[PDB]
Each structure stands twice: as structure tokens, then as C-alpha cells.
Structure 1
Amino acid sequence: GGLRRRDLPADPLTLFERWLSQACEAKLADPTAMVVATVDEHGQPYQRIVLLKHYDEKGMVFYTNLGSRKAHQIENNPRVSLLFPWHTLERQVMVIGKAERLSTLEVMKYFHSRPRDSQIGAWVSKQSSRISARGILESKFLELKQKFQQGEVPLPSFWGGFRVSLEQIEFWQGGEHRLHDRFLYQRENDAWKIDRLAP
């Protein structure tokens, strides 16, 4: 029907929750899937999809291997962008913010909630490094599955997470004639300034 300023909530998370809710409702594949962009030391941007696992006023959270390329890039430049590719629903949500590491307590809690095969898998991969063959991953997996016996499957020291703060959140919704609705929520010291952007 359209997206009019007068219908927007004060808090952008409120609109995001609604859009996330309807996305699950429409059964999109991986509704929590978002593309996270980071930048290396030479100014080159990099992208990969990760899953949003939690969000609130403090920011959006995802977990990853601390030795990965994104991790290395975030340590040198914490500025990141997140984009939810919801175009089958004629929508997009883009977030601008800084990524900060989650504490051990937060990570252990989420880690032990994952399927065991995934916990073991976490142990297996030296994420982003070049490896000579797939078999390396497969032998290790087997090796560890039995090594643990699974007693509790330990939290790898190289496993962690990041929380991306909400400095800016942009909502995009398809419009005919290429005239789409775009609203940019921008942090103004606790409060949110809203502007419609030309498509």
C-alpha cells in the first residue's frame, strides 16, 4: 500500500520487528540472514552473509570465528554495514554501526545452545584461511567427535561474536515507476531523526 512518514514508529526497531515478523510469516529462506560488509586496511570492502541472532537497542548480534577475515578487518576498522536482502518482499533494511566484541559469558551461553555437530564443526574450521583440501575438515571433524565423547563439547577460544551498534537504519520498500519509499533513521544522541530519501 505504500510507506508514509506519518505511519512510522518512533523507534526503528519497532518497524524492523514488524518487517522481520512478516518475513518469517512469508517463509523467506533464512529471514535472519544479513549481508555484513567490513573494510580492510587498504580501503577494500568485503562481504559475506551471517545470521542475526539477537537484537535490541544496543545493536545487532552475530557469531563468528575470531581468526576469520571479517574479524581481522573489524579489529582494524570497526565500522560495518548490515543489509537484509528482503527484495522478494520488495524490501531492504540497511544498518550502519560499529562492531564490538561480545563477552565470554554471552558467547558460552549461545554456543552451548547450538546443535552438537555444529559445536564440533566450530572446532574444525580455521575460517577464511587457505586449506589444501576438503578432507582436512572431514578428518578433524571425525577425530573431534570421538575426542569429546561429547561430555560437554568445549567453547573454542577462537570462537566469538560481535554486536553492531545502531547509528543509522534505512528502510526501503518497493515503489512503482522506480519511485520507491526510503526512510533513514539517524541517531541524534539517544533520539532518532527521520528523513525520506529520494529513490
Structure 2
Amino acid sequence: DELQQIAHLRREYTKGGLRRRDLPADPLTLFERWLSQACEAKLADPTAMVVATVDEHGQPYQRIVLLKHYDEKGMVFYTNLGSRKAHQIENNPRVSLLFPWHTLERQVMVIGKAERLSTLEVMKYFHSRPRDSQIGAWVSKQSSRISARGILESKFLELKQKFQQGEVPLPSFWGGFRVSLEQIEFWQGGEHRLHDRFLYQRENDAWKIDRLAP
């Protein structure tokens, strides 16, 4: 029996490395640098990140969402408040975020608590979104099973007509979450599978920082 073709897919990572002397006191400083370099390398969706949530049975779920804001208080993403992730977050606020920057031979993983954004900040953001996107927010009962795509298309045309030139109101079931920064791991690929790993861990007000074996 021969190995599957994919068993042979592999790549040595020689773009760079990460040493303790390269680390800033604030993890967000390094994240900002990396994000900036991702935007410059021209990744298709530099702000795309995978958010993992856990349901009531201890089962993890994942889906990509976009990072739309970040500061010391956490990383932000917008979503339908009636969705599977939102319902999972309701019961277990613990989440994980992963920026899949492996084309740049890097990973950034964050652990923290997800909490709802205020209606106010959501409104601010909602009105900067493309008009068809605002309508679409109204159309989709995110995560719920639907009979066919026609249901969405029909509803979209219906709502577009209804909203005719006026402002599309913010649906009460559309909002977002702010994920606190409890831990942040940075990964930079290396050779011989000996990558660089540094984990920032919130310890009271400061950050405990350790290198983790690859």
C-alpha cells in the first residue's frame, strides 16, 4: 500500500525567525507589525481569523470571521447574534482566535473571553458597511437551516424594495463580540521542524512570556 500523495506535501520554513530579544513588551506591538506585513505581502484576507467556540457538550466549533478592530481591551468581530457561535458564546464565553498566516510562515493565536459589543459601537460600524451588506444582515437567519437558496434571494429583493433609498436599520439580532487578551502565542516557522514559539500570558497586570518547544 503506497502513501497518499498528500503524505508528501511539506515545506521547510526559512523566511525568518523570532528571538526573545525581538519581542516588544506589549504583544499587540508585535501583532501590529505582523498584521502590517501581512497586508503588504498582499494576503487575500489579512484580517481573516478562525474563531473557535465550544458548545454545551464540550464540542468545539470553528468558522472564519474578520478582525474589524483591536486594542488593549481585545479583538473585535461582527456577526449575527442569533447564530450558532453567538449561542455557544452565551453559555461558554471562552474562545480562541487563530490568524492563519502560514503563507508568511506565521501564526498568531489568542485566548480570551468573548463579550458583546454595545449597540452604540455596532451602529457606528453597521452604517459604514456596504448597503447590500446591511440588507443581507436582515435577510439571513445565520446558522439556521433553510429549505433552499431561493429563500434568501427572495427575501433580499423583498427587503431591498422595502428599504427603498432610506437608511437600512440595524437589526436587533446583528452585533458583535470583543475578545479579551488573556494569552497570545506567536509562531514563526523554522527548519527541521524546529520553529520559534513565544506565549504571552496575562499575569495580573503584566505579561509572563515563555518560549514553547515546537
Q: Under TM normalisation by the shorter chain, which class is it?
A: over 0.9
Aligned Cα root-mean-square deviation (Å): 0.5
1:25 maps to which residue?
Answer: 40
Residues 107-166 of structure 1 deviation map (CA, whole Å, 9 limit, x = unaligned)? 000000000000000000000000000000000000111101131110001001000000
Q: TM-score, normalised by structure 2?
A: 0.92
Distance across 2 between alignment mates of 1:162 and 1:2: 33
Structure 1 gap ranges (5+): none
Distance across 2 between alignment mates of 1:44 and 1:52: 24
Give the deviation of 1:2 after TM superposition.
1.6
| Secondary structure at the counterpart of residue 61 of structure 2 | strand
| Secondary structure at the counterpart of residue 52 of structure 2 | strand
| Secondary structure at the counterpart of residue 85 of structure 1 | strand
Distance across 1 between alignment mates of 2:205 and 2:134: 37
Pick the aligned partner of 1:102 from 89, 95, 117: 117
Residues 154-188 of structure 1 deviation map (CA, whole Å, 9 limit, x = unaligned)? 00010010000000000000000000000000001
Distance across 1 between alignment mates of 2:90 and 2:158: 32
Q: TM-score, normalised by structure 1?
A: 0.99
1:12 maps to which residue?
Answer: 27
Percent identity (aligned): 100
What is the total number of aligned residue pairs between the two structures?
A: 199
Give the deviation of 1:189 after TM superposition.
1.1
Distance across 1 between alignment mates of 2:205 and 2:114: 18
Distance across 2 between alignment mates of 1:57 and 1:43: 29
Distance across 1 between alignment mates of 2:205 and 2:126: 31
| Secondary structure at the counterpart of residue 123 of structure 2 | helix
| Secondary structure at the counterpart of residue 88 of structure 2 | helix
Give the deviation of 1:6 after TM superposition.
1.0
| Secondary structure at the counterpart of residue 50 of structure 2 | strand
Distance across 1 between alignment mates of 2:136 and 2:70: 25
Structure 2 gap ranges (5+): 1-15
Distance across 1 between alignment mates of 2:112 and 2:104: 25
2:210 pairs with 1:195: yes
